[PDB]
Structures are given as structure tokens and as C-alpha cells.
Amino acid sequence: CWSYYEGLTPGWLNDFYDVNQITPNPAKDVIELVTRIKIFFNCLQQNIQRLRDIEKKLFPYINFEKLETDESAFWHTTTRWNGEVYHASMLEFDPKNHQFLRSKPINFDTGLSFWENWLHTVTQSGSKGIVISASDVQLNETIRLLKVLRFIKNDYPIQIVHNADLSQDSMKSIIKYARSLDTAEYPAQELWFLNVHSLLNPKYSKKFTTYSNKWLALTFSSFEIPILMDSDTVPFVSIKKFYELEEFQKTGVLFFKDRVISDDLFESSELKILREIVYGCIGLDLEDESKIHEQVEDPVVAQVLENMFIKKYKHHLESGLVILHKGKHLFSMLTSIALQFSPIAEYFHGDKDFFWLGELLSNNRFTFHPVDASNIGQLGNVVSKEFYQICSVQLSHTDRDGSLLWLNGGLNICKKTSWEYDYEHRQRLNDMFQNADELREYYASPVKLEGIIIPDTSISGWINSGECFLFNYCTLFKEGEFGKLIKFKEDEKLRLSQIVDIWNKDI
């Protein structure tokens, strides 16, 4: 359906939005970005140089110039823990034992599209692996994650993706903690490094910043079915348990729910623009709450849309742990990237919420894990006339049965370097300590995982304590009144205490 793209303005582009750019019609601009990508992957189901000209305007962040001229310079480079380097190569792994097999070279089929090439010629079908977006900044957090993966005896390969911003020193240190002291109880990890800098066109290569790097990590990872993790993420179950979750099995995405923040609400002008985008993309009308439940078959997804368009909430997905099957979700993911650098980029915090918005607006099947996000730490007694309170930076995620799956925020009190501000401005910290230096030591001290509270946001939700530079939140539980409590057994407390110990091990 070349006719569509010939009908567009000659200079048309899926460009990365800039605040300076004059945008009178943001809703229509977003609808165009989503539609142009939808039309593309639909007309591929139905002139090689014509296709490439559309690709260059749809995906300008790809360095198609280098692919066409000096193909070997364009392709990404993977580096194994052993020190072996692979150029323009496809990594293959054993689906059963997850161990590395071979690296067949990339034979780019000119008859197929770039993204079709990426799934068939560049990537091994069914390949599963842990993916982490890391610069030199994320070194320490990445080390601490590796230690925990080794402690729980992870067999899945790990790939650390960077944009030529991870030093040889950092990689050496990662390989050390990944491989050293190999044993059955603390096995070495099949770790890889991936530099995507060659794939990215120099104009857009620098535009992927902070959380946006996670799109580079996820998209270009050597696995078809990556499990993306924050460096500050901590899994408390074997990786296979995440893949086994029914939500991923049925949809091919594993998405977890975020904190409910009732402080930070959308303006009516913002919701009007979001309503136009949704209707413009998938013909869904979000005018009244009654007709939302009707038009959305999955009540878990309906609840998220109710929260956004009725209750005006901005935070829905936590991208600390994400599974995405690129075989079923690549076109959705590429829409997420378009939206990430769209006029509505400023509406949401980082990447997390563009995961599900990409799925929704692309009209691809998705869902969330239905369990609400939870707080984890010490069950402090609240004086009333069982009342418990947890105040932490840690955001936990439990299964239906109530087992801890994972958390984001690391396993120290506070990761932020805010002790100077926090000591002067927060009463509890100001009274409790004598200097800001004493607060620094408290912030660096390990956390103690004794229980979990799943707050009832309708009665007593998430309350910002102001501690750790307004990253610390308090959750309340009162028996038969509001919330759900989960007290860890001595067996569990011991396992968790061992995991916090290995995480906090002072480099």
C-alpha cells in the first residue's frame, strides 16, 4: 500500500519530538506516528529501494546509511565473558539448558524488511535471556544484581547492553563477579556485552538518554524473548518462574502494576489529547466510566484505563522487570519508541508507561499481572485507640499466592546522595541523627525484609515520607479496616536476609 506513503507530505518523518518544535496538533501528530507504523507492518503481509526510503522516514534512529555502505561497520558487536568478540553474528543458545551453542554470521536478506531481518537473520527464534541497560553509572547496581542471580543459581544467559558508554574497567569488574569462585551453590553466569552505537544514526544516537536506553537494551538484545531488568531490580524467584506466569504465556508480555500516586494527576487538557489519540488509533471512546468496562474485554486493562481517564492517574506500569516476545510484539515495541520521543513524552515519567501505551495504540493483545504493587521492609507498630506501617524506597511485586517475585529500589535504605538536603529538611532524620554524615551511613545501611503491605489506595494509599529525596513512601495496614499484610516465615526471612547480605557486600 505504497499509495498511503505517497499521499503523505514529501518531507514526512517519524522524528524525535523537541519542545522548541511548533506543535499546534499534538494528538494528530501522535496518531500519525502510530498509524504510519501500523500501515507498514500490515502492508508487509501483502521496489526494495522504496521500502528502505519508508524505513528511513519511519525509523530514522537506525543508521541505514552505514548498513548500505560498510555493512560490517553498521552491525552491533557482542562480547562474551571469556573475552571472545563477535561482529555481524547471531548468537544461538540451547532452549532447554540455556547454555551458548554457536554464532552463525548475519546474512541480511535484501528481499526482507530490516525488522523482519532482525527477527529471522539477526535473532535466534525462542532465545530467552536476562537483559540490563547499563552505563558506567550503573556498574555497582549491576554487580549486586549478578551476585543475587549467582546466589539463586541462575542458568539463563545475561546480556549487558550499552551505547559505547561502558568502560573496559567496568566490563572486567562485571566479568570478575560473574565468573570468579565458580561452584554448584554459586555458579558462574553466561554473561555477554552488546554495543548498539554502530546501529544508531549519529543524530539520534545521543537522544536515547537515561530510561530511554532501556529501549536500546530491549530492542537490540540477542534474545527474541528477553526478560529486561533494572540494575536496581532484585528477583527472589528463579527466572523460569517469570516466563511460567500465565500472563506472559497467553499474551507474550509480562507487565507489572506501579504505585498508585493520587498526588500527581493529569490536567483536563492532557486527558482530552490522550482521549483523541486513543480514539484516533483504535476507535475506543473514553467519554464516561460506564462504557470503558464495556469496550475493554480484560478487566485488569479496563481498571488501568479507568485509573487514567476517570481518576486522572499518571503511573500504571513499573518497567523494573519486563518480559516481551519480539516475535509477537516487535511492531508494538517500535510504537512504544515512537511515543517515547513524541509530543506526549512529557506526560509520563521515563519509559515504563509507553510499554502498555505502545501495545494499546498498536491494537496488539496485552495484559498486566493483576496483583497491585506493594511496600516491603520492617512492620513498624502504629499506636491507635494489628496496625502496621512500612516506609521504604523498595517497590515489591507478589504472586496471587502471596510469594515475593521481585522488587525495584535495591536493598539499601536509600540509593540517592541526598543526606545533606534530607537531614536539614526532614524532621524524623534531623532529630534521629546528629550530622548529615550519620544519615549518609543510615541511607547506605542494608534494609530488613520482615513483611509486605499491599495498600488499599481507596482508603489509605501510598504517602510520600519526603525521605530519600521524596523517593521514600509509607503504606499502612489495619486488620479488618484496609490493606493486605504478608508476614514472612523464619525460613523465608532467612533466605531474604541472605539475599540482602550478598547484595550489600561492600563491593
Ligand X SMILES: Nc1nc2c(ncn2[C@@H]2O[C@H](COP(=O)(O)OP(=O)(O)O[C@H]3O[C@H](CO)[C@@H](O)[C@H](O)[C@@H]3O)[C@@H](O)[C@H]2O)c(=O)[nH]1
Residues making contact with Mn ion (CB under 5 A): 230, 232, 408
Q: Measured between alpha carbons, how far is 141 from 504 in angstroms, rounded to an integer?
A: 10
Q: Are 423 and 431 in contact (CB under 8 A)?
A: no
Q: Measured between alpha carbons, how far is 146 from 189 in angstroms, rounded to an integer?
A: 8
Cβ 107 to Na ion shortest distance, Å? 15
Binding flag, residue 219, ligand X (CB under 6 A): no
- Binding partner at 318 among Mn ion, ligand X, Na ion, none, C-beta below 5 to 8 Å by kind: ligand X
Binding flag, residue 221, ligand X (CB under 6 A): no
Query: By CB under 6 A, what part of segment 337-366 binds ligand X?
Result: 349-352
Cβ 232 to Mn ion shortest distance, Å? 4
Q: If we measure between CA atoms, which residue out of 365, 224, 368 comes closest to residue 308? A: 368
Cβ 343 to ligand X shortest distance, Å? 18
Chain residue whose CB lies nearest ligand X: 350
- Binding partner at 351 among ligand X, Mn ion, Na ion, none, C-beta below 5 to 8 Å by kind: ligand X
What is the gyration radius of the CA atoms in the chain, in angstroms? Answer: 23
Task: Output 351 or 359, the one with its CB closest to ligand X.
Answer: 351
Q: Measured between alpha carbons, how far is 360 from 18 in angstroms, rounded to an integer?
A: 24
Kindly write down the DSSP assignment for every residue of 60-120, as one continuous string.
Answer: TTB-HHHHHSSHHHHS-EEEETTS-EEESEEEEE-TTT--EEEEEE----TTS-HHHHIII
The residues, ordered by sequence, that sit 6+ positions from 269 with a Cβ below 8 Å of its Cβ are none
Binding flag, residue 135, ligand X (CB under 6 A): yes
Binding flag, residue 240, ligand X (CB under 6 A): no
CA distances in angstroms from 347 to 294, 344, 373, 383, listed in the order given: 26, 5, 21, 39
Q: Which stretch binds ligand X (CB under 6 A): 9-17, 132-140, 301-309, 384-392?
A: 132-140
Q: Measured between alpha carbons, how far is 377 from 465 in angstroms, rounded to an integer?
A: 15
User: 503511573: which residue's cell?
Assistant: 315
Binding flag, residue 422, ligand X (CB under 6 A): no
- Binding partner at 214 among ligand X, Na ion, Mn ion, none, C-beta below 5 to 8 Å by kind: ligand X
Count the residues in the chain.
Answer: 507
- Binding partner at 127 among Mn ion, ligand X, Na ion, none, C-beta below 5 to 8 Å by kind: none
Cβ 74 to ligand X shortest distance, Å? 21
Cβ 144 to ligand X shortest distance, Å? 11
Cβ 9 to ligand X shortest distance, Å? 33
Q: Which stretch binds ligand X (CB under 6 A): 104-112, 113-121, 230-238, 337-345?
A: 230-238
Task: Output 173 or 363, the one with its CB closest to ligand X.
Answer: 173
Distance of CA 352 to the CA centre of its chain: 6
Binding flag, residue 116, Na ion (CB under 5 A): yes
Q: Measured between alpha carbons, how far is 206 from 193 in angstroms, rounded to an integer?
A: 20
Helices (H) then strands (E): counts for the chain: 21, 20
Q: Are 460 and 501 in contact (CB under 8 A)?
A: no
H-only helix segments in 231-298:
239-244, 246-251, 268-282, 290-295
- Binding partner at 138 among Mn ion, Na ion, ligand X, none, C-beta below 5 to 8 Å by kind: ligand X
Binding flag, residue 213, ligand X (CB under 6 A): yes
Q: Which stretch binds ligand X (CB under 6 A): 22-30, 224-232, 427-435, 446-454?
A: 224-232
Q: Measured between alpha carbons, how far is 453 from 435 in angstroms, rounded to an integer?
A: 32
Cβ 487 to Mn ion shortest distance, Å? 26
Binding flag, residue 336, ligand X (CB under 6 A): no
- Binding partner at 116 among ligand X, Mn ion, Na ion, none, C-beta below 5 to 8 Å by kind: Na ion
C-alpha cell belonging to residue 188: 558462574
Binding flag, residue 211, ligand X (CB under 6 A): yes
Cβ 232 to ligand X shortest distance, Å? 4
Cβ 496 to ligand X shortest distance, Å? 20
Question: Residue numbers of the site for Na ion (CB under 5 A)?
Answer: 116
Contact residues toward ligand X (CB under 6 A) are 132-135, 137-138, 162, 210-211, 213-214, 230-232, 318-320, 349-352, 408
